[PDB]
Amino acid sequence: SMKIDVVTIFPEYLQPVGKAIDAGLVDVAVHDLRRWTHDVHKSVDDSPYGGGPGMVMKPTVWGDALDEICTSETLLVVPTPAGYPFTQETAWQWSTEDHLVIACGRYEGIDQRVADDAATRMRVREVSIGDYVLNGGEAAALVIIEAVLRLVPGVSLLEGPSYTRPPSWRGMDVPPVLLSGDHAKIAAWRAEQSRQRTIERRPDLLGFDSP
Amino acid sequence: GSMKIDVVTIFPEYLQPVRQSLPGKAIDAGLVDVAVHDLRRWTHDVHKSVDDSPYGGGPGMVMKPTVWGDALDEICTSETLLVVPTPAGYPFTQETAWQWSTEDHLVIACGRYEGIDQRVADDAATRMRVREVSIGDYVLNGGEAAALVIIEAVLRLVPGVLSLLEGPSYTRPPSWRGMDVPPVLLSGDHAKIAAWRAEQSRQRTIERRPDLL
Numbered sequence: 001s002m003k004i005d006v007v008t009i010f011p012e013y014l015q016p017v018g019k020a021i022d023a024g025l026v027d028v029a030v031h032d033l034r035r036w037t038h039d040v041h042k043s044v045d046d047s048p049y050g051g052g053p054g055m056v057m058k059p060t061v062w063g064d065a066l067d068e069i070c071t072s073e074t075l076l077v078v079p080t081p082a083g084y085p086f087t088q089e090t091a092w093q094w095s096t097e098d099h100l101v102i103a104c105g106r107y108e109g110i111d112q113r114v115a116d117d118a119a120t121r122m123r124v125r126e127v128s129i130g131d132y133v134l135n136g137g138e139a140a141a142l143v144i145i146e147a148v149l150r151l152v153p154g155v156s157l158l159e160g161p162s163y164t165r166p167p168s169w170r171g172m173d174v175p176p177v178l179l180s181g182d183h184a185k186i187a188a189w190r191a192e193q194s195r196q197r198t199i200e201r202r203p204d205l206l207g208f209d210s211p
Numbered sequence: 212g213s214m215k216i217d218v219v220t221i222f223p224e225y226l227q228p229v230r231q232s233l234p235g236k237a238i239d240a241g242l243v244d245v246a247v248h249d250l251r252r253w254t255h256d257v258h259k260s261v262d263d264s265p266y267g268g269g270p271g272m273v274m275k276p277t278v279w280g281d282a283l284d285e286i287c288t289s290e291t292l293l294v295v296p297t298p299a300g301y302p303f304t305q306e307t308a309w310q311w312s313t314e315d316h317l318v319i320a321c322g323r324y325e326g327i328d329q330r331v332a333d334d335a336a337t338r339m340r341v342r343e344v345s346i347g348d349y350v351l352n353g354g355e356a357a358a359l360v361i362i363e364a365v366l367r368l369v370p371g372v373l374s375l376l377e378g379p380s381y382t383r384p385p386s387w388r389g390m391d392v393p394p395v396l397l398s399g400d401h402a403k404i405a406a407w408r409a410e411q412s413r414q415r416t417i418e419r420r421p422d423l424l
């Protein structure tokens with residue numbers, strides 16, 4: 001059993017309701033960060049100190065929210081292009097956690113003091129899901145949850161090509177070996193394929209130079 | 212400029228957020244159109260089948276060439292760029308988003324389980340440009356959230372629609388819970404602040420991303 005919490009200013013995104021199939025092995029909650037503002041305008045951003053383009057999310061509003069939602073046992077996830085890589089190994093690790101809280105930021109970023117503060121009560125991980133930029137952590141929140149949840153109790157190199165019926169389609173055939181029943185020959189051919197594909201699409205995975 | 216995105220999936224509900232995350236004005240100006248399609252209208256049987264056992268043995272299922280064949284024949288033109296998210300794909304980077312941002316028709320095929328029959332992509336590639344791609348180093352159940360990422364990533368690069376690491380950022384108030392904003396940022400010395408940020412970026416990148424260096 002495991003509890004996942006998500007905070008965003010766009011709570012409509014996370015509503016798919018895959019990760020959806022649950023027989024109560026985990027519960028998931030989504031919160032509107034505006035639930036913790038006070039002024040009539042609901043202001044959650046301000047201009048950066050030192051200058052530069054765009055807005056930053058205020059430290060006070062996030063701080064209040066997390067006070068209410070987080071505990072000392074909590075793992076705090078902050079998706080961000082400036083964070084550590086989020087890999088298969090990270091998913092395995094977080095599949096054992098009791099409590100995850102994902103903080104979705106928009107604009108240019110969130111005050112640094114927010115995660116520095118949190119880091120004195122609970123454990124915090126700033127993470128990047130890939131080398132590209134999004135508008136907000138909302139999509140990243142989703143990716144992280146899919147990757148993590150599919151490893152939770154009760155649910156190398158690259159993988160080569162897959163086939164199924166029919167054995168001949170539009171004049172293209174399934175590789176004979178797959179049809180012949182030799183468990184040996186099929187494992188070998190499959191290993192060859194998987195390796196031939198990594199050298200091409202992902203040379204770094206076998207310690208080579210990236211294109 | 213003017214871009215059309217078709218998405219095929221056995222979960223068309225999942226893609227609710229992309230079309231509910233769009234500026235109305237760009238839809239009015241013909242800057243982008245996004246259509247989601249349920250992969251099952253192209254099924255041939257009364258059970259509406261999308262997958263089938265792996266040739267060669269193994270666990271998990273493979274997706275039928277017959278169905279995806281029908282589907283792509285209908286949606287794709289020969290100007291089409293066919294995107295297929297998979298963990299065995301090429302890396303989807305920022306350079307990739309930039310490139311695709313100037314394309315006219317993007318077709319994204321969302322597969323599930325252990326993939327789509329290889330022949331589908333093989334065949335498509337005889338009459339259009341196909342790109343199989345991985346959004347990161349981890350396995351997701353299906354291609355759906357990957358599609359979400361890619362769409363958001365590419366469209367925030369189309370005007371009027373939606374190297375080291377960036378260092379910390381701060382805003383009002385100057386003091387919060389006993390932590391102060393770095394005093395250099397209020398100094399009025401902009402040549403000096405440009406350099407402070409530079410160091411911050413380097414340090415960060417060394418810690419978090421020593422590959423980039």
Ligand SMILES: O=C(O)c1cccc(CSc2cccs2)c1
Pocket residue numbers: 079080081105106107108109110127128129130131132133134135136137138140
């Ligand atoms: O922290 C923020 O305020 C912020 C600003 C922009 C975008 C995001 C999530 S973006 C992302 C990029 C790669 C992996 S995740 C967050």
